[PDB]
Short mmCIF file of N, CA and C and ligand atoms in Angstrom, two decimals:
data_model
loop_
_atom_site.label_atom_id
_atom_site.label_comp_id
_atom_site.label_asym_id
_atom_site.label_seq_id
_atom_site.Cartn_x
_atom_site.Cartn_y
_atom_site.Cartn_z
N UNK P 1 5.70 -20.57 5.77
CA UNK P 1 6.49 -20.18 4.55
C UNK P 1 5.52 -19.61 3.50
N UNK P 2 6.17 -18.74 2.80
CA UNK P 2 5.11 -17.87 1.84
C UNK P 2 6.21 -17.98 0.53
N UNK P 3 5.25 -16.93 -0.71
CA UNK P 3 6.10 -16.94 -2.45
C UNK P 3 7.01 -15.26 -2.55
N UNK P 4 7.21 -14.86 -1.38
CA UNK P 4 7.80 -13.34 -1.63
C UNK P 4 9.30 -13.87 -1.72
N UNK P 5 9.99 -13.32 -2.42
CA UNK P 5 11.47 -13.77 -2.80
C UNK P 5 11.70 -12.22 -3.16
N UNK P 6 13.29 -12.41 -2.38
CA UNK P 6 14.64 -11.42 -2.85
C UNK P 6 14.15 -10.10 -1.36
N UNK P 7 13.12 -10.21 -0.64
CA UNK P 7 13.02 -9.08 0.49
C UNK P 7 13.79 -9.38 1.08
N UNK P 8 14.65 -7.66 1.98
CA UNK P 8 15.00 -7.86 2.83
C UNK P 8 14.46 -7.75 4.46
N UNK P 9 14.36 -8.25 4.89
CA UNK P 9 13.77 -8.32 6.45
C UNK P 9 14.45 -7.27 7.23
N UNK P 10 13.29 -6.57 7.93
CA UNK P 10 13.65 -5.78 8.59
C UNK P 10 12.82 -5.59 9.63
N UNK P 11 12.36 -6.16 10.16
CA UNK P 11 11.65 -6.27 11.34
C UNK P 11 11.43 -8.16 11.78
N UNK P 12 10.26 -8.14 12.55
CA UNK P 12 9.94 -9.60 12.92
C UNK P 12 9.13 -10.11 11.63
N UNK P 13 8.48 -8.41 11.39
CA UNK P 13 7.06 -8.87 10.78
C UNK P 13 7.05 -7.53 9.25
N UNK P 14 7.97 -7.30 9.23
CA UNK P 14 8.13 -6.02 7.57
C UNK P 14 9.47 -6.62 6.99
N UNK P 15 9.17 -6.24 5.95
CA UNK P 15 10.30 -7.18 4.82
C UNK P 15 10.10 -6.25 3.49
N UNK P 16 11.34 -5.67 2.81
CA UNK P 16 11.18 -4.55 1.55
C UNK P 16 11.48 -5.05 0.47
N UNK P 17 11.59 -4.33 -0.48
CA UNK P 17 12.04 -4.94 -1.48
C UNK P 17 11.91 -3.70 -2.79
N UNK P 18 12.86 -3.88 -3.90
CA UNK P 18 12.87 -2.35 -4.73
C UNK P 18 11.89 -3.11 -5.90
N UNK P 19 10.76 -2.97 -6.16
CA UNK P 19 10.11 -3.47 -7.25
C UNK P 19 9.04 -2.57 -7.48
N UNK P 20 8.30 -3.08 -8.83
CA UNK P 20 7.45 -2.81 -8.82
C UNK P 20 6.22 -3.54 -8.14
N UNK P 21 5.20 -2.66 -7.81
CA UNK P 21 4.13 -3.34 -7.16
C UNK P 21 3.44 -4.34 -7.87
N UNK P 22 3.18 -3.83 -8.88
CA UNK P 22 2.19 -4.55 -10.25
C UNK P 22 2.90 -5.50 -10.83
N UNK P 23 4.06 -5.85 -10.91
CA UNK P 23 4.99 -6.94 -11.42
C UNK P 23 5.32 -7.98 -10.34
N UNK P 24 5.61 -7.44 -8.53
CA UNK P 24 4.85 -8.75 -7.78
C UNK P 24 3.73 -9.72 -7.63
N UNK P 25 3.05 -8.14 -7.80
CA UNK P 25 1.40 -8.71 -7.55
C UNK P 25 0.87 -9.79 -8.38
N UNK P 26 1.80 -9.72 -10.21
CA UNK P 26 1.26 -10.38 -11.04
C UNK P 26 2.24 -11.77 -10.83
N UNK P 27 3.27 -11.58 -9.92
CA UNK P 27 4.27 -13.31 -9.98
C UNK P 27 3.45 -14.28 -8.60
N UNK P 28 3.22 -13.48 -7.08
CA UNK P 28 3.00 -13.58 -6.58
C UNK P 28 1.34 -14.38 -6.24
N UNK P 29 0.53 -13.25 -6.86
CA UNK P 29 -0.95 -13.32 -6.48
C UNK P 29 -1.44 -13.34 -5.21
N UNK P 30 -0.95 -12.75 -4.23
CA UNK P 30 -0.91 -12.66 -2.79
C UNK P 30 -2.60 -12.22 -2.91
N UNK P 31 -2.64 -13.02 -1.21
CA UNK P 31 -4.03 -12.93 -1.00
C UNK P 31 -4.68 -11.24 -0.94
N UNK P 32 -3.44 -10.22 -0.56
CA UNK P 32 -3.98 -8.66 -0.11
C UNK P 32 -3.08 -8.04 -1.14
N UNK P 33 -3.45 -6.90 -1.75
CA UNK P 33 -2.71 -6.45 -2.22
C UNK P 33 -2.62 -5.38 -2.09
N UNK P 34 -2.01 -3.89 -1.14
CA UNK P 34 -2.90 -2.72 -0.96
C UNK P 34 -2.57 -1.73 -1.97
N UNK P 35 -3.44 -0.90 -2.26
CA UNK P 35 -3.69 0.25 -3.23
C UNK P 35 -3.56 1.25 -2.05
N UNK P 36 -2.84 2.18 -2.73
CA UNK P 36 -2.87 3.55 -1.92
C UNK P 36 -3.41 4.84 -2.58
N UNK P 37 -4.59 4.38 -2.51
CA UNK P 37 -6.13 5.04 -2.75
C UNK P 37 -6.20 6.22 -2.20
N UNK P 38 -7.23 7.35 -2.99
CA UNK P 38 -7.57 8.30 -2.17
C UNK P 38 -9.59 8.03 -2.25
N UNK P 39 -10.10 8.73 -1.29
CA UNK P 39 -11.48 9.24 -0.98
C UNK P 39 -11.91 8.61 -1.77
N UNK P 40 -11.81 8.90 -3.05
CA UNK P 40 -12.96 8.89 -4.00
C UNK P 40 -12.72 7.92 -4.96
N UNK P 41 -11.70 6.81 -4.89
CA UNK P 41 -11.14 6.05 -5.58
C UNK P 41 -11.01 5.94 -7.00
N UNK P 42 -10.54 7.06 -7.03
CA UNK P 42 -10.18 7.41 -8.08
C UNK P 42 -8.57 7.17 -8.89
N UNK P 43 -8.14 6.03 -9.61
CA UNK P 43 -7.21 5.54 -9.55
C UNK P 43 -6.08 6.10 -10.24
N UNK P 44 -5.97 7.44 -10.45
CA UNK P 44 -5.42 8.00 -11.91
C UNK P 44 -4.36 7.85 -11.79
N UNK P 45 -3.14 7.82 -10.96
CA UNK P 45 -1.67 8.43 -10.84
C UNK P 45 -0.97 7.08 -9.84
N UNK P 46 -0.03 6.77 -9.95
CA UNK P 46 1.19 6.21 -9.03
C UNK P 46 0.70 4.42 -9.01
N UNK P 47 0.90 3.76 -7.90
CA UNK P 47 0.06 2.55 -7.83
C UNK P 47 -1.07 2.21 -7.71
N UNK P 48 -1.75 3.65 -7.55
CA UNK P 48 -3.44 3.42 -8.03
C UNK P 48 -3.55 3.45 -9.52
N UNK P 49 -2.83 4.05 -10.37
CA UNK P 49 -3.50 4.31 -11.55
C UNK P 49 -2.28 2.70 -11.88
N UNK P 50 -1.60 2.69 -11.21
CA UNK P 50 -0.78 1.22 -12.37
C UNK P 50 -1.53 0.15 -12.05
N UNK P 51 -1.83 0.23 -10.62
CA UNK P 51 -2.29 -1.20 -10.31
C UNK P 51 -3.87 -1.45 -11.34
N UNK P 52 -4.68 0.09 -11.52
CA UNK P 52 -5.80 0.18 -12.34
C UNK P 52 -5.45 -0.43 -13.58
N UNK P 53 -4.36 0.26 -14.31
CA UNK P 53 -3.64 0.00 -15.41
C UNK P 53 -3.83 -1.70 -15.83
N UNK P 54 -3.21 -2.18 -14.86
CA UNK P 54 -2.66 -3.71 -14.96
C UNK P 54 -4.13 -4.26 -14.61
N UNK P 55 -5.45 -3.82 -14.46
CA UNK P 55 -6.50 -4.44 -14.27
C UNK P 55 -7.46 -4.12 -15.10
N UNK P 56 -6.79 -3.63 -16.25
CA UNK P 56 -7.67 -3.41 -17.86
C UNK P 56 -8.76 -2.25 -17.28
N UNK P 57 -8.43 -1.64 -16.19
CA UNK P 57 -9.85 -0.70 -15.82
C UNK P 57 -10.80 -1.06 -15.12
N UNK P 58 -10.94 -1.98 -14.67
CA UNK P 58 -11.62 -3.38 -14.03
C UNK P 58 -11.85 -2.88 -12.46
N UNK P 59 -10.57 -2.78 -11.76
CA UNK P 59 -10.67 -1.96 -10.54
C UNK P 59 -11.50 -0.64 -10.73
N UNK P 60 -11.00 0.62 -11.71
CA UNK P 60 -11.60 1.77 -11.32
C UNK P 60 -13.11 1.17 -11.35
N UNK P 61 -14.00 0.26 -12.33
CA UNK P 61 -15.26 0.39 -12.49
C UNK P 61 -15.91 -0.33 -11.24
N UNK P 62 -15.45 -1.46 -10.75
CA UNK P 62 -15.49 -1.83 -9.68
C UNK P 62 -16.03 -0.42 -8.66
N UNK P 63 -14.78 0.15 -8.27
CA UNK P 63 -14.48 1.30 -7.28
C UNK P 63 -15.78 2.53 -7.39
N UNK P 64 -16.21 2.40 -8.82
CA UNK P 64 -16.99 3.91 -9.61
C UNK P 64 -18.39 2.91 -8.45
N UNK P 65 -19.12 1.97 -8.15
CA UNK P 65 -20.01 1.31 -8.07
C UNK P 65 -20.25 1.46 -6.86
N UNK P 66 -18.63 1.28 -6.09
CA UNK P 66 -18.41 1.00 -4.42
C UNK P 66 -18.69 2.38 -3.78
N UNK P 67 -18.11 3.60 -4.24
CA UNK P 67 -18.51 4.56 -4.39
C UNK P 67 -20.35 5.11 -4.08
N UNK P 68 -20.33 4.75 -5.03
CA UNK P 68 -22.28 5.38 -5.85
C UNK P 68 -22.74 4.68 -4.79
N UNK P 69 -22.58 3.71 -4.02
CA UNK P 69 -23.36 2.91 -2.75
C UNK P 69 -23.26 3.38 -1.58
N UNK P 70 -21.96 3.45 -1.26
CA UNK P 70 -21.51 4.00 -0.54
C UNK P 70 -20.66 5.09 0.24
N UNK P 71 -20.84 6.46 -0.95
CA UNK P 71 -19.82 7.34 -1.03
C UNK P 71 -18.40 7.13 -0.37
N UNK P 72 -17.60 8.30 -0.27
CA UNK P 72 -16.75 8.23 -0.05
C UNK P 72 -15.43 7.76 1.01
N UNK P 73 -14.48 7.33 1.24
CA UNK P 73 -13.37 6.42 2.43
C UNK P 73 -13.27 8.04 3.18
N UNK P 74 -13.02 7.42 4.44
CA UNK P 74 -12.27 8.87 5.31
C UNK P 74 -10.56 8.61 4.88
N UNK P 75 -10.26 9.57 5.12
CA UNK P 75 -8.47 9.78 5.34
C UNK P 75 -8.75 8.93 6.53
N UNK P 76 -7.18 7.93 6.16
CA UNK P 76 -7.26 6.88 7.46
C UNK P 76 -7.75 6.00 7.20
N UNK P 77 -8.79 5.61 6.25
CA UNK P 77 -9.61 4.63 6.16
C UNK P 77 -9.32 3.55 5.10
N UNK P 78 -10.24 2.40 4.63
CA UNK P 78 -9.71 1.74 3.96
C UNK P 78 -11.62 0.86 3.49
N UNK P 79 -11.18 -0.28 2.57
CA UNK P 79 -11.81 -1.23 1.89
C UNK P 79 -11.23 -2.00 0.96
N UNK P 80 -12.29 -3.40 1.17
CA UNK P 80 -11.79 -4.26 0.61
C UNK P 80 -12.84 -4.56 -0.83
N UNK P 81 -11.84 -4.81 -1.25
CA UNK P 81 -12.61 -4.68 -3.14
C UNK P 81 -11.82 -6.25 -3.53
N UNK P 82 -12.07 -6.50 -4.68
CA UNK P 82 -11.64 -7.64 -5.55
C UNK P 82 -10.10 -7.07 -5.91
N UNK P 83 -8.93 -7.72 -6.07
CA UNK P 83 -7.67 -8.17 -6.50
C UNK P 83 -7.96 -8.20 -7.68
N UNK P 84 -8.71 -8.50 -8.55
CA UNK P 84 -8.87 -8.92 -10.04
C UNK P 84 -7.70 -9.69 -10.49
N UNK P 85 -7.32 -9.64 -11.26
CA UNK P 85 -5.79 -10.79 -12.05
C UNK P 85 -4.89 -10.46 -11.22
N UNK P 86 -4.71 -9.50 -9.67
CA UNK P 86 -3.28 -9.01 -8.99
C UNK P 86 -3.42 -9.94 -8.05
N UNK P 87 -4.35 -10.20 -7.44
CA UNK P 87 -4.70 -10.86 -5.87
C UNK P 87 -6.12 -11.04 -5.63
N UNK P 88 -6.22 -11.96 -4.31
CA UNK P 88 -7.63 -12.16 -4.00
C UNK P 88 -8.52 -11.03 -4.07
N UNK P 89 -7.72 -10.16 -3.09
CA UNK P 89 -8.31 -9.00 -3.01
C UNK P 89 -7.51 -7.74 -3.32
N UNK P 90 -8.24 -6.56 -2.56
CA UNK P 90 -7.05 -4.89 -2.90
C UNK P 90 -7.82 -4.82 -1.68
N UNK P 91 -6.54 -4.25 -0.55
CA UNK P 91 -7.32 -2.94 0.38
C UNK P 91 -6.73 -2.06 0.14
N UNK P 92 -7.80 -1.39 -0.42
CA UNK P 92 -7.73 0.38 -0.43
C UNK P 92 -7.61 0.92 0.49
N UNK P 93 -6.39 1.44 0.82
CA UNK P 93 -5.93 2.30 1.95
C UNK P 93 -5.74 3.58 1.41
N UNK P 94 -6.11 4.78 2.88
CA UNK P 94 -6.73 6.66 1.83
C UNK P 94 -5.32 6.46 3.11
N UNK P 95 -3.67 7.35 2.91
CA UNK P 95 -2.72 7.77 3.84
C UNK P 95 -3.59 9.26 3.57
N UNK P 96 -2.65 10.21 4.62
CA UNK P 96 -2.72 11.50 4.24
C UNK P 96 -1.85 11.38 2.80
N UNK P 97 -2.64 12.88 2.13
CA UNK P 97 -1.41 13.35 0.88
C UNK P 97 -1.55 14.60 1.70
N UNK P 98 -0.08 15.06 1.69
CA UNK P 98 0.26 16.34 2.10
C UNK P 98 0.15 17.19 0.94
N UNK P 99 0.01 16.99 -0.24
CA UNK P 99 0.30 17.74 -1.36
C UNK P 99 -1.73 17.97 -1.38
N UNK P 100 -2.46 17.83 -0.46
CA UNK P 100 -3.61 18.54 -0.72
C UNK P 100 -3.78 18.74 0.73
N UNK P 101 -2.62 19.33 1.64
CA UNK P 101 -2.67 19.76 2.86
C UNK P 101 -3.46 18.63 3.61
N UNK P 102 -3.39 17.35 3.98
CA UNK P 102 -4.01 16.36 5.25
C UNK P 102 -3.11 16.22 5.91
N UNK P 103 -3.51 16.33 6.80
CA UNK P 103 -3.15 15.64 8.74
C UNK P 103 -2.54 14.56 8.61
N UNK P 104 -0.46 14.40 8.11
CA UNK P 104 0.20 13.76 8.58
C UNK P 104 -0.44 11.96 9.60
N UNK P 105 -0.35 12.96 10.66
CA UNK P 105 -1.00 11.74 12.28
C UNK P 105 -1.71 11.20 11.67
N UNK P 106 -2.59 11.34 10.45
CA UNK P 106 -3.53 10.53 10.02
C UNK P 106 -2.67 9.08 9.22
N UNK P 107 -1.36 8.88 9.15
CA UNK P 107 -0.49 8.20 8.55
C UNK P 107 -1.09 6.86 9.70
N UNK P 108 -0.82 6.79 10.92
CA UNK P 108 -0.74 5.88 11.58
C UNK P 108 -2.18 4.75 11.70
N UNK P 109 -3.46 5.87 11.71
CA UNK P 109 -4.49 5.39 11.24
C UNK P 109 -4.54 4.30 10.14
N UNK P 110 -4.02 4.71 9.02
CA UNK P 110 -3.99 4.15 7.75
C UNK P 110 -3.53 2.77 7.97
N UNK P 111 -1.92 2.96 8.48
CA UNK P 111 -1.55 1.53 8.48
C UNK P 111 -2.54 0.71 9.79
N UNK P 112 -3.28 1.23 10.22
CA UNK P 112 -3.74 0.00 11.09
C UNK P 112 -4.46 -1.03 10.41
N UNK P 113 -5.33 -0.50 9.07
CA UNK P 113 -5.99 -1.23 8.49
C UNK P 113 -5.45 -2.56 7.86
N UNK P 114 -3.63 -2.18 8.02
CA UNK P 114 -3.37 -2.97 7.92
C UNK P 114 -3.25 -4.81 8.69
N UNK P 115 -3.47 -3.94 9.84
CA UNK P 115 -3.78 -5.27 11.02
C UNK P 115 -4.92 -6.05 10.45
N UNK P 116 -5.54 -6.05 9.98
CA UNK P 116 -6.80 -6.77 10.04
C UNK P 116 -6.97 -8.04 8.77
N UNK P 117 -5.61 -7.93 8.43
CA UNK P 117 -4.83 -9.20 7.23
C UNK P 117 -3.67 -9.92 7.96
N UNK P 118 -3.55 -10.92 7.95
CA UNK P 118 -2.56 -11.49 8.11
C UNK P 118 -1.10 -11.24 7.34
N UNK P 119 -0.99 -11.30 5.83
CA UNK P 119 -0.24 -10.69 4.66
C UNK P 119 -0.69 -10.20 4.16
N UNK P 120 -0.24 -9.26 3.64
CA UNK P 120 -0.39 -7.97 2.65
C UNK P 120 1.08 -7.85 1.54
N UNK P 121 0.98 -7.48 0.78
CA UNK P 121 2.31 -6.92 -0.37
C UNK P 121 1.92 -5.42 0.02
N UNK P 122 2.29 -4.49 -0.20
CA UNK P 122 1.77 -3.24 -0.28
C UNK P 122 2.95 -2.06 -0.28
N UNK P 123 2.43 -1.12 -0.87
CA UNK P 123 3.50 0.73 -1.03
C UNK P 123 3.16 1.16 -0.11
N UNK P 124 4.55 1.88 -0.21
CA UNK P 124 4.73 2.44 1.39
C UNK P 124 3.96 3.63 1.18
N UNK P 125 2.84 3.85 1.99
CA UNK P 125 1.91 4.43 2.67
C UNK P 125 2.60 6.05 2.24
N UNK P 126 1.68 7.06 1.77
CA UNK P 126 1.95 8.67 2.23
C UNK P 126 3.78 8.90 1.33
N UNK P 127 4.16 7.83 0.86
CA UNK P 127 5.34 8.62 0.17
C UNK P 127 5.02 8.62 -1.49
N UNK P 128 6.15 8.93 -2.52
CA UNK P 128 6.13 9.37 -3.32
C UNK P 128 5.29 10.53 -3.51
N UNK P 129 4.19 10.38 -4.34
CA UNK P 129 3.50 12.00 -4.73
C UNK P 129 2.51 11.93 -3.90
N UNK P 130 2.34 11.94 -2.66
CA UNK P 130 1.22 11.68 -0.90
C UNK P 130 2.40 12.71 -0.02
N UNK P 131 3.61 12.97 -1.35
CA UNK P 131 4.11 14.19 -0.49
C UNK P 131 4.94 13.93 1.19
N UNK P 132 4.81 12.97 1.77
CA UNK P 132 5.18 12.55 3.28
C UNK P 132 6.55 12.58 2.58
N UNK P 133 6.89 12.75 4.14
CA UNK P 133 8.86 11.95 4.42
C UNK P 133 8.49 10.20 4.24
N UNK P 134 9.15 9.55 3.38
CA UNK P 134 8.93 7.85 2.91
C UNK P 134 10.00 7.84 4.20
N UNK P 135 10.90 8.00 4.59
CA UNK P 135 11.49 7.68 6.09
C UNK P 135 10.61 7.57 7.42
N UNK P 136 9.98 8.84 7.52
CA UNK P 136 8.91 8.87 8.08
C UNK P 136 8.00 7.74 8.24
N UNK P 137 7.41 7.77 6.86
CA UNK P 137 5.99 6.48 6.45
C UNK P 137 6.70 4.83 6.73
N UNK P 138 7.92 4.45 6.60
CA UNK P 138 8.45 3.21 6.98
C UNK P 138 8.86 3.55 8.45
N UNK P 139 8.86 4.18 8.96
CA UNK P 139 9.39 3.95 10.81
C UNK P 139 7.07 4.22 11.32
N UNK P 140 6.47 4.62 10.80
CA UNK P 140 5.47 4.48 11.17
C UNK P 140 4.74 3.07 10.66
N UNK P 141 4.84 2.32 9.71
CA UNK P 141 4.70 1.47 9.19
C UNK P 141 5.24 0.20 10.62
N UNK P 142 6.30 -0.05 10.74
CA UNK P 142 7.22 -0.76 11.21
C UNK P 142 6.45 -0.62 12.98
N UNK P 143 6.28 0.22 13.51
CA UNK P 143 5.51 0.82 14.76
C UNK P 143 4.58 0.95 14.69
N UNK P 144 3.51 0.03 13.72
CA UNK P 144 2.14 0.19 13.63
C UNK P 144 1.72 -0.64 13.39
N UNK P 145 1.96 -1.97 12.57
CA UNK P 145 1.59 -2.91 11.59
C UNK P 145 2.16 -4.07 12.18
N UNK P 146 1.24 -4.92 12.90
CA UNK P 146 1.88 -6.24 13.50
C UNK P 146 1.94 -7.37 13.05
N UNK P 147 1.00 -7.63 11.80
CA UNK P 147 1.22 -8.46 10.68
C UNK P 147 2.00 -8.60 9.58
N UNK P 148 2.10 -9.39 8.68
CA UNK P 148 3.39 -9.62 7.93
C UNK P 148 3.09 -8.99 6.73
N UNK P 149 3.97 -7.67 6.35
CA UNK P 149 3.86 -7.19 5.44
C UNK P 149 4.78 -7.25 4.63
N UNK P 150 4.87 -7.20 3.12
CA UNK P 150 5.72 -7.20 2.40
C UNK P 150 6.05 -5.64 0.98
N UNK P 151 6.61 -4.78 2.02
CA UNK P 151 6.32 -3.80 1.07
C UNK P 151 7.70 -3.75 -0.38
N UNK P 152 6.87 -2.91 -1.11
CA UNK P 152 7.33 -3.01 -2.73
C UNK P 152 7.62 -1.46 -2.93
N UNK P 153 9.11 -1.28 -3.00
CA UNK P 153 9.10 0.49 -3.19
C UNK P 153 9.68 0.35 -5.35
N UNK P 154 9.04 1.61 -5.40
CA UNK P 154 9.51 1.02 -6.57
C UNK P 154 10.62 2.20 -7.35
N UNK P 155 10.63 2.99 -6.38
CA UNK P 155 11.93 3.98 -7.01
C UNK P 155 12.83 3.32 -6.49
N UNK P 156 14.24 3.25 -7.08
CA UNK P 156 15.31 2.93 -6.73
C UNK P 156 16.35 3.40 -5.46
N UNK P 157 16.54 4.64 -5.95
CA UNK P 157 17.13 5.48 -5.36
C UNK P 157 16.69 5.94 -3.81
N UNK P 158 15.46 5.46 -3.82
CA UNK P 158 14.34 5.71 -2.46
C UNK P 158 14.56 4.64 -1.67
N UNK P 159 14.36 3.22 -2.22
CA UNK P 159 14.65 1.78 -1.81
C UNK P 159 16.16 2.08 -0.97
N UNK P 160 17.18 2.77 -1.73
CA UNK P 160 18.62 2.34 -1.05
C UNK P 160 18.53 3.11 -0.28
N UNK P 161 17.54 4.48 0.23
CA UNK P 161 18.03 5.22 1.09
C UNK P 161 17.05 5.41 2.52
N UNK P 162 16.13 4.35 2.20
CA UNK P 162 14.82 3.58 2.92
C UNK P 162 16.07 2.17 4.09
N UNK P 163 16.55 1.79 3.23
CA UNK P 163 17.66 0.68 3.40
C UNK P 163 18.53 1.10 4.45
N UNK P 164 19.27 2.06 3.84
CA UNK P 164 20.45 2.54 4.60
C UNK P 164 20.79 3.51 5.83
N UNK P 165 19.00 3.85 5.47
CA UNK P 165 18.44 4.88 7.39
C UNK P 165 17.92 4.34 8.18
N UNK P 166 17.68 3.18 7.92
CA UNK P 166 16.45 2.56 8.92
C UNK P 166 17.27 2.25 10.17
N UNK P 167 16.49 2.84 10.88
CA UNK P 167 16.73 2.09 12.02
C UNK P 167 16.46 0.63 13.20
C1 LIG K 201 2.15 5.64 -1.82
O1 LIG K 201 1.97 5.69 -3.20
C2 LIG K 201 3.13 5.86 -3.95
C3 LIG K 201 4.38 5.63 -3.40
C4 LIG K 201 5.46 5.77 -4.24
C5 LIG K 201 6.90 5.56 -3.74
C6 LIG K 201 7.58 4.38 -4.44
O2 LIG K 201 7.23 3.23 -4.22
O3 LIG K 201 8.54 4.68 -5.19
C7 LIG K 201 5.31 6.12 -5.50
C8 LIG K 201 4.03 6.35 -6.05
C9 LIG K 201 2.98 6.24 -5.26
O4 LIG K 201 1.75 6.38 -5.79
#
């Protein structure tokens, strides 16, 4: 038994829910929390820049450090950084963004990183402004990810129609 309340289940092991990410993360405190990061972790826009937001800046300077050591994540790729006040930790997961032309197939990559947690909270991978079909990114999600995830969509209108296609 776990603290995620109001998901609906939709698999053995995926469970949704219409929220915000940063307003679970802060009831919850789940051990993973994923960021849907690009390359250079650079947190400016969507649940990188909120989840940054909600970490007083704390994450990006973190990230500016992880970086300078070790340059940049591949598309596909991922790391684990500090959670700060959200969770134990953040894995930074890079999906493709189609909106700077990347390799789709690289979607499936991404979520594997998710295997390597037991729970995770996390946004659905490659949608909103990452440009993908979010139909798409949840049937690859669901066919990729064998651990228990708890994803957080936080448009509305996306949530009911994430809901009402799934297969
Ligand atoms: C995958 O990252 C994002 C996904 C979404 C879709 C949503 O949850 O409404 C919005 C903004 C994002 O940055």
């Amino acid at each position: 038994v776990n603290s995620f309340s109001g998901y609906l289940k939709l698999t053995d092991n995926v469970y949704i829910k219409n929220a915000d990410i940063v307003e679970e993360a802060k009831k919850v405190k789940p051990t993973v929390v994923v960021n849907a990061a690009n390359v250079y972790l650079k947190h400016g826009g969507g649940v990188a820049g909120a989840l940054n937001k909600a970490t007083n800046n704390a994450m990006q300077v973190e990230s500016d450090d992880y970086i300078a050591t070790n340059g940049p994540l591949k598309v596909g790729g991922s790391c684990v950084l500090s959670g700060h006040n959200l969770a134990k930790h953040c894995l930074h997961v890079v999906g493709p963004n189609v909106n700077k032309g990347e390799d789709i197939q690289l979607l499936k990559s991404a979520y594997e990183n998710f295997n390597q947690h037991e729970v995770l909270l996390a946004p659905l991978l490659s949608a909103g402004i990452f440009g993908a079909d979010p139909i798409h990114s949840l049937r690859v999600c669901v066919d990729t990810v064998r651990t228990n995830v708890y994803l957080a969509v936080f448009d509305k209108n996306l949530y009911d129609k994430l809901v009402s296609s799934f297969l």
